[PDB]
């Protein structure tokens, strides 16, 4: 890529423990003498974080790229300003809007652009011997900055640029969050005095900035600085001096902390809501001194370990060539009825066949067809005019939906409608499709009417001669390419099926796996999903029943589509948890009781 | 027994099984049915507690 440094004995990272860190304000609401619980992104107490060293005054300089999760907690123990800037991005290759926040000795620069970062970007000042001055020299961050989206430069100031040695004297805590594109940074400074490790105690976190940006931040990195003077061998490729400071990076989790608001309105105490039973009691009672007694908590739940899939082995595939976009269909008064069964159905094999115009499934989601098992697939195909497409819907009026095809109110099925002008349109007109004008009565759902008798408008009996008030019901359309869009023919296919009603065999392409018993795991049978234990049964079923329901109206027994065995479903969520406490002033230990 | 049988009622829906509804319809559409079921069960529990 660019340039790199040699002689970097990177020590293996170590794991350390925190001491109540990451307690900020939930919002801009003042609270006093009131205990309120929020649900944001905090850091769990007594958590395990990673400790990265950077002391050199030996030979330690490691600052890799870390993935940006939901909230980042960055602690920095320094004494001479070692941590410099921060970068946020995703790929870092001049193809993603990268954010760079640097605290230069003259200005604080914040640039949302498209930088080209190297393998090891950093800064480096030079210290002279004849004169005491700290000037910046090496700036190995980006090679060129072309496009940008945001630029902010702070006021010119004077920075001392420290570089002494000793013990840690400053602690900087930063909390980064991203909510609806808004990047919120909270900063806190503390003038402590200790050797190493991590200082304890509790302190509030004041907000710093809230940038209303809108980028996709995936990873981040921290750029430090190097000191070059008379201690360096005399080159910028191998000699370097990181300094002597420590930094801890941790990921925030959606926890719940109860804060103690006094008369001043500042957070002086934080209690966890999910760690110890005493902490849970203090969270529930919204207090600190729990009296002697017993309290019921959440029920015991077993987390699933595996997930078995059960479906019958079906090899045949449902033909969609003659169903969708074939060659010649019937009219509207005598629609074509087709039966589809004993094959694997799928909707992802329809977009590549022909580009449709309208697709709507009433009573079932269009993207959840493969997650269920179809039952009795009836395809009603016909060809109508573009001016009567909206009439074909469960709950509409008109003439075509009343004197030809009927849809029930509680109809659960899909309807597809696509234009067909390449074949159903002639230069002189297509007179092969007929439609019924009027009718004496209505039509029952799913009924074919092939009555070719003389219709009677009012008075004057016809007696088969076609005279006054004696019109013919079957009339022709007028499919011609010289007309508009509404006059073009449209092929409409209605697919009707049942969802968990009779033991069918359509289902989807979901293959079956293994089978494990005596475990509370997930399972799927004929599209019906459940969670529990599948134990052996001893009852006798009937050769036309699949699922079984008792008094509680739940799936008690299930028949396997392959082994043809009956398995009983048993839930594992059964148990109570209680915490017995003798008092806060007495002791801090409690007792756990399982009912 | 009445509280057990209350789980079989529909309260103006299509079924009483939550998994059956979640497997047949998308989440951004069964919210009204879930709310109606929750309201009916809460009313039944309130009557039982009274």
């Amino acid at each position: 890529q660019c340039v790199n440094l040699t002689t970097r004995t990177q020590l293996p990272p170590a794991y350390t423990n925190s001491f109540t860190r990451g307690v900020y304000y939930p919002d801009k609401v003042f609270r006093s003498s009131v205990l309120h619980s929020t649900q944001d992104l905090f850091l769990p107490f007594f958590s395990n974080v990673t400790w990265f060293h950077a002391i050199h005054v030996t030979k330690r300089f490691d600052n890799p790229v870390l993935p940006f999760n939901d909230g980042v907690y960055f602690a920095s123990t320094e004494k001479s300003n070692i941590i410099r800037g921060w970068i946020f991005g995703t790929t870092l290759d001049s193809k993603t809007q990268s954010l760079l926040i640097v605290n230069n000795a003259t200005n604080v620069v914040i640039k949302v652009c498209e930088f080209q970062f190297c393998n090891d970007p950093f800064l480096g000042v030079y210290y002279h011997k004849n004169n005491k001055s700290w000037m910046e020299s090496e700036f190995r961050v980006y090679s060129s900055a072309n496009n940008c989206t945001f630029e902010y430069v702070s006021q010119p100031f004077l920075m001392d640029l420290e570089g002494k040695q000793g013990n840690f004297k400053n602690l900087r805590e930063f909390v980064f969050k991203n909510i609806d594109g808004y990047f919120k940074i909270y900063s806190k400074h503390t003038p402590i005095n200790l050797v190493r490790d991590l200082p304890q105690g509790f302190s509030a976190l004041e907000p710093l900035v809230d940038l209303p940006i809108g980028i996709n931040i995936t990873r981040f990195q921290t750029l430090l600085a190097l000191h070059r003077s008379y201690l360096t061998p005399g080159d910028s490729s191998s000699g370097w001096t990181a300094g002597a400071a420590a930094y801890y990076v941790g990921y925030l989790q959606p926890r719940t902390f109860l804060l103690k608001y006094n008369e001043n309105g500042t957070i002086t105490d934080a209690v966890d809501c999910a760690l110890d039973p005493l902490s849970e009691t203090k969270c529930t009672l919204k207090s600190f001194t729990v009296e002697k007694g017993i309290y019921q908590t959440s029920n015991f739940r077993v987390q699933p370990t595996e997930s078995i899939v059960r479906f019958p082995n079906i090899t045949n595939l449902c033909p969609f060539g003659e169903v969708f976009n074939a060659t010649r269909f019937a009219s509207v008064y005598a629609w074509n009825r087709k039966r589809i069964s004993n094959c694997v159905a799928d909707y992802s094999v329809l977009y590549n066949s022909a580009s449709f115009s309208t697709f709507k499934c009433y009573g079932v989601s269009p993207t959840k067809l493969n997650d269920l098992c179809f039952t009795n697939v009836y395809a009603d195909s016909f060809v109508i005019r573009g001016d009567e497409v909206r009439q074909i819907a469960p709950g509409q009026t008109g003439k075509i939906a009343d004197y030809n095809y009927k849809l029930p109110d509680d109809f659960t099925g899909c309807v597809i409608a696509w234009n067909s002008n390449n074949l159903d349109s002639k230069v002189g007109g297509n007179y092969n499709y007929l439609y019924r004008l009027f009718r004496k009565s209505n039509l029952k759902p799913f009924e074919r009417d092939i009555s070719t008798e003389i219709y009677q408008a009012g008075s004057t009996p016809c007696n088969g001669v076609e005279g006054f008030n004696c019109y013919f019901p079957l009339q022709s359309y007028g499919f011609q390419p010289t007309n508009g869009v509404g006059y073009q023919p449209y092929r409409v296919v209605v697919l009707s099926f049942e969802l968990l009603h009779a033991p069918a065999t359509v289902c989807g392409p979901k293959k079956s796996t293994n089978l494990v018993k005596n475990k509370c795991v997930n399972f799927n049978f004929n599209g019906l999903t459940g969670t529990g234990v599948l134990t052996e049964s001893n009852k006798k079923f009937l050769p036309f029943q699949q699922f079984g329901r008792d008094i509680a109206d739940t799936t008690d027994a299930v028949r396997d589509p392959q082994t043809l065995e009956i398995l009983d479903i048993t839930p594992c969520s059964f148990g109570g948890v209680s915490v017995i406490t003798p008092g806060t002033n007495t002791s801090n230990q409690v007792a756990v009781l399982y009912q | 027994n009445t509280l057990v049988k209350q789980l079989s009622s529909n309260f103006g829906a299509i079924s009483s099984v939550l998994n059956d509804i979640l497997s047949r319809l998308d989440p951004p559409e069964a919210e009204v049915q879930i709310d109606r079921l929750i309201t009916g069960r809460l009313q039944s529990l309130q009557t039982y507690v009274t």
Binding site: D550, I551, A552, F574, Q595 | -
Partner: peptide
């Protein structure tokens, strides 16, 4: 077997689904 008498034993005998109810929150 317990610490009761004969009249108490007679009265106790005159006074007289569980998992199906417990598997839905209804606990005892």
């Amino acid at each position: 077997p317990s610490k009761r008498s004969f009249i108490e034993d007679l009265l106790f005998n005159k006074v007289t689904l569980i998992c199906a109810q417990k598997f839905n929150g209804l606990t005892v």
